[PDB]
Design a protein around this ligand. Structure first.
Ligand code: ADP
Lengths: 67, 357
């Protein structure tokens, strides 16, 4: 459990590479839910730019699944 | 034309200044419960002239972010719509809360509400008929409305209702209200003339909508066995009584209308909405959770109708991935923590991904 390290940020557009529309939409919606739960912070530089997640102020489990 | 984007500043949960969009021809607004989707619907209504009483507040200043907890974030707020048209410069319509009252602006020039409404009407946006906006929990009521209330909608859109007061006056002057009405001469002719004027105005709109609705209800149903009928209870004076609306669902036997499912009522309501558009086109529709009662088959048929038409733009709020994954882009609403809940948005382009496997 300790060896499941992660990154400083997650790119939504990178996560959605080689996904279909329904899968990509579900990942986008998951970012909204994680933000509501304060599990992540979100930044988007411009409309329709990449959306970048960084760790939020609340812990969250199963983040290796969600990413 | 079309709604290019909305700009919102300190309106309900939308703290700060935020760009909503830009919109594509078919855009869906999505997000978890409590994020601010209903406040965004209110912002659209607000910039399109909605009266304060229909915006879930007692007074206008309560629309400023933070007001419902006694911590208003500013002494002003606004919502602005950027309206675009091929061959024309963008036109910005804004409603600003200043001094506890509304100030209306077109391209940053202050106008009175009368002129604001008149300019919106030239674009196909009718701030009284409001035939371009369907609220959450309301789509079924369009199909099951009282026939007399359907007539009122047609009198507003057709402007026949502007003649109703004079019609009533001349009808009484002719003898209506007496035990034996004795119409003759000038008074009877004056009534017959206003009756004809009201009939002609009403029918110019109604006959167009009634003759186009069947093809649209079929095209929504994507099936030639579906049928839709609009008819006046009073053929001689259609504006005087109700407008009947009956349908035969596709591949089904006839049922009254009230025995239909929520989904079937929804499709019938959309056919009427789009049949009105065929007579007086609106630039965009804002549809709030119209898919609530639709099964997956009807969700696909409705989305395909929008996409094979998006002569209008569609902005939908949806909780159902089966519907929102058919849009070109998503506007995602999320909450930020604070004294009041703050809403912010993200934008995501679905057209970059194959809708397949
Ligand atoms: N003027 C306001 N200032 C701050 N927050 C507001 C204001 N008006 C409404 N809200 C907040 O917006 C929240 C509701 O957002 P809502 O649009 O109903 O979520 P959703 O429709 O996505 O489920 C409430 O917590 C409510 O207090």
């Amino acid at each position: 459990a300790l060896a499941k390290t992660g990154a400083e940020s997650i790119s939504l557009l990178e996560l959605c590479r080689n996904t279909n529309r329904k899968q990509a939409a579900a990942k986008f919606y998951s970012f909204l839910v994680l933000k509501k739960q304060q599990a992540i912070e979100l930044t988007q530089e411009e409309p329709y730019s990449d959306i970048i997640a960084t760790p939020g102020p609340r812990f969250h489990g199963s983040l290796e699944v969600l990413f | 034309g079309f709604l290019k984007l909305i700009e919102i500043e300190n309106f309900k949960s939308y703290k700060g200044r935020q760009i909503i969009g830009p919109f594509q021809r078919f855009t869906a607004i999505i997000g978890p419960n409590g994020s601010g989707k209903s406040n965004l619907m209110d912002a659209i209504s607000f910039v399109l002239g909605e009266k304060t009483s229909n915006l879930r507040v007692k007074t206008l200043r309560d629309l400023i972010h933070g007001a419902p907890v006694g911590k208003p974030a500013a002494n002003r707020a606004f919502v602005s719509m950027v309206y675009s048209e091929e061959g024309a410069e963008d036109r910005t319509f804004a409603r600003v809360i200043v001094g506890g009252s509304s100030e209306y602006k077109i391209n940053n020039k202050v106008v009175q509400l009368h002129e604001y409404s008149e300019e919106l009407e030239k674009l196909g946006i009718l701030i009284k008929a409001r035939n371009f906006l369907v609220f959450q929990g309301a789509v079924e009521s369009i199909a099951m409305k009282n026939p007399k209330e359907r007539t009122a909608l047609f009198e507003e859109i057709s402007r026949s209702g502007e003649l109703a007061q004079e019609y009533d006056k001349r009808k009484k002057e002719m003898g209506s209200g007496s035990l034996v009405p004795r119409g003759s001469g000038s008074a009877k002719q004056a009534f017959e003339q206003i009756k004809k004027e009201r009939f002609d105005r009403f029918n110019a709109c109604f006959e167009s909508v009634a003759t186009n609705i069947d093809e649209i209800y079929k095209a929504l149903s994507r099936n030639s066995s579906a049928q839709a009928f609009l008819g006046p209870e009073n053929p001689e004076e259609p504006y005087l009584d109700g407008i009947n609306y009956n349908c035969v669902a596709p591949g089904k036997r006839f049922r009254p209308m009230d025995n239909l499912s929520g989904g079937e009522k929804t499709v019938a309501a959309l056919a009427l909405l789009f049949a009105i558009h065929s007579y007086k086109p609106a630039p965009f529709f804002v549809l709030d959770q119209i898919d609530a009662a639709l099964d997956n088959t009807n969700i696909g048929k409705v989305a395909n109708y929008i996409k094979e038409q998006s002569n209008f733009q569609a902005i939908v709020i949806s909780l159902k991935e089966e519907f929102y994954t058919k849009a070109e882009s998503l506007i995602g609403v999320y909450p930020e923590q604070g004294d009041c809940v703050i809403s912010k948005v993200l934008t995501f382009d679905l057209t970059k991904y194959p809708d397949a496997n």
